[PDB]
Design a protein around this nucleic acid. Structure first.
Ligand SMILES: [Mg+2]
Ligand SMILES: [Mg+2]
Ligand SMILES: [Mg+2]
Ligand SMILES: [Mg+2]
Ligand SMILES: [Mg+2]
Ligand SMILES: [Mg+2]
Lengths: 7, 240, 235, 7, 225, 238, 8
RNA sequence: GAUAACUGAAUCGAAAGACAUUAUCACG
RNA sequence: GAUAACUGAAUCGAAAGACAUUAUCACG
């Protein structure tokens, strides 16, 4: 899963 | 439960950018499904199925018309305050719309990618009007990311509740808690922790990075929807 | 934007009562669908339709578990003697409940179509077997229950002026658009009066509660008649 | 429909 | 092998009477199957079964046309054996075809229909299945009698079901098909036994037609014109 | 009707050779069908179809047992001097053989329709894959073998003028009626020359034998390719 | 498909 | 004969244009 | 719970061997 830098 | 966090002048626009991602996901489905529904008009054995899809494409089209006519600035009181709306108050209806949409897509995705795919094959004995494997992957991948985005919007602001839970997220939590809970190395997408955000700036920034990711997925989805429309045309639609 | 209206000590209980209606609607379907899904195991040609029903029954059972485990008092800040820089507004409290109703109603709209129309036809085309279909009366009760939950949801929302595009129901908008290109007889088109206090909402909710309970019982009755029909024919 | 006393 | 027995002037007519029984058995099926095949059009799940029945009804119709257009006097001093042999052979071919169709129609298709639809309006009656089996058994035994009574039997003319009953008996120690057939000693004796057989088979064919009408009526009452 | 033609000492053997071609056709089917029927035991949705095939394979295995246990010399009276004019006529001897061929061929027609058309569609509809279907090449071989056995049987019968309504094959009559209502020519519609002696029949039988044997080998080869497919696509473990 | 002297 | 009608804007057609005055199916 | 039993000799297994004392199916 492409999760933003720092969710 | 939430944030102390107040709206700023840039909040209205942030909300429109989030809603626009949802409109683009909805529209993408509506466009491919109009096409599929047109081809199916010429297959006698798929008449009732065709109607079931029509019933779904109406629901999507309704959601998309609702989103496109929503003016977010109407529902936002910035101050100059403390008349100022809290950021939670403002995100909540947006998140709630996302949740409704996502659950709708879950039902449709099951019908469209599983049972109907099988029914089609059983009824027609060919693959002319099935989906491609790659479209199914893009379908699942896009849903997964919109699930996670919606989870992030809600959990990062601590506005979660039973009523906002998504079926698939709770499934993965309940499955983990009776399978292991390998909660550090954690391959599962939905099982990773969400950090609280501490300001609107931090939300704004993470929204934008999310926006870039989802836009990517929506373009891959559109690509695969064009490949499959082309297939239907080449395999079924066109004359011989 | 809403009401000036604050929560009272009796708000928590009002919310639980509203939620209980929805749990009863959901459960009523879940029970009749478990049964149908079990009779369909025996019919080879309805295998994929069976799975589609399973997918719907799961969504309902999830919405019902979520509603049953929601503790409404947890999400409500009443103040002390009506402390205002703590007391929740009534709108803040109803909104998530109304939103849940809307999501559930839209799900029922999709399931009702599948179950009462296209599947009924599919069943006759596949089997010619009318023992497998719903009774006409169960279909009438299905529609009648949906219409009233639609209207109840419209009332909760419009009466407090917390409506928005995001909370509009497809069928209500369809009736408004249809009317504007044809004062009036239609169920969904009738004006909703703003309520001016919680007392007035409380009282109207209770009257609504009586009506919906009522429709839910007629629905349960027709669901039992149909379960009995399948049982008499299939075992 | 049935809409209670005053809706 | 055989008789020594010669044809007489009444032989041509005897043969036409035997062939007419077979035409009547074939036609009876053809009529009920045309009906069924028509009702099945409406059932989407039965489409490939319907086409299998069509394939069978065409074979029956072909056998019936072939029998009806055969002029027995054209093919008739000839020995009585020479004349009965092609008739017996036609009976055998028909009987084996019926064995296959009967299995498909009364067993596997009946089960497939219930599995697909749960719809018992679409099935045969128990009584039609009894009349089906009873008619087959008698045509088997009649064919066995035509062949064995004249000693024109051979491996190539054996019927599956008769041989099954013999092999089954030889590995146990009375069965319809296992009973001895007396050699006939003249055409008069054959003529007479034929006529008594004709009476019995005509009785069975009427019971079959009756049950076929009961089922056709059933499908019509439930499924409409 | 017929020839005038008498049996010779070599007649018994000619008949055994003809019968053996039929046995080999029957056995070739029985072998592939035993295999298919075994794979199908493991597919719950194909249970009743499996029983229909079993019913067919039994009818084939019965015809093949009958042919294999038939002793042709038992049913032939040769006389002892080329004439002996109580010697069996060649027609009397071929007729039951031709009749057995006809019965078989008609059975194969029914089975071929079920096996290559309706069942193939039913399998796909029921299982949603091609793991237990036939190959296109096996279906071609099936049809090509049938067509040749039809024509061979037509040749046996017409060449001796022993034809009758009772010996007509459905497919040959269909081609004749179809032509007479339409009216690179159709294999079954071509004229068959009367034979004038047993020597001429013997030699044409032998040439036919060589052709049918070629077709039976092609059929066997495609039956092995398909058995291998079923093994690789369904049978074996994953 | 068919050997010499069968057909014409 | 039978089947098929979004609260659509697709579909088919190189185009013109077609879309129940239509399309498809069939032991017709 | 349900389903599956040729008048077979195939099928599965590298093998030993398995084949109703079996195999398969089933809403997280
Ligand atoms: Mg359907
Ligand atoms: Mg389906
Ligand atoms: Mg069957
Ligand atoms: Mg079939
Ligand atoms: Mg319309
Ligand atoms: Mg619209």
């Amino acid at each position: 899963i492409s999760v933003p830098p720092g969710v | 439960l939430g944030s102390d966090i107040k709206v700023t002048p840039g909040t209205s626009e942030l909300v429109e950018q989030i809603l626009a991602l949802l409109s683009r996901y909805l529209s993408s489905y509506i466009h491919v499904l109009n096409k599929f529904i047109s081809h199916l008009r010429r297959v006698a054995t798929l008449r009732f199925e065709r109607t079931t899809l029509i019933k779904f494409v109406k629901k999507l089209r309704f959601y998309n018309d609702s989103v496109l006519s929503y003016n977010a600035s109407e529902f936002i009181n910035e101050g100059k305050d403390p008349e100022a709306d809290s950021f939670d108050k403002v995100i909540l209806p947006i998140a709630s719309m996302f949740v409704k949409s996502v659950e709708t897509f879950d039902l449709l995705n099951y019908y469209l990618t599983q049972s109907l795919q099988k029914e089609i094959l059983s009824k027609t004995l060919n693959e002319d009007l099935t989906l491609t494997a790659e479209s199914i992957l893009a379908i699942d991948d896009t849903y997964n990311h919109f699930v996670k985005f919606s989870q992030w919007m809600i959990e990062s602001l601590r506005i979660g509740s039973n009523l906002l839970d998504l079926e698939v997220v709770q499934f993965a939590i309940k499955s983990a808690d009776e399978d292991g809970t390998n909660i550090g190395e954690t391959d599962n997408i939905f099982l990773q922790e969400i950090l609280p955000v501490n300001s609107e700036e931090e939300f704004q920034t993470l929204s934008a990075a999310w926006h870039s990711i989802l836009d990517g997925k929506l373009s891959a989805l559109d690509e695969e929807f064009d490949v499959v429309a082309t297939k239907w045309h080449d395999k079924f639609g066109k004359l011989k």
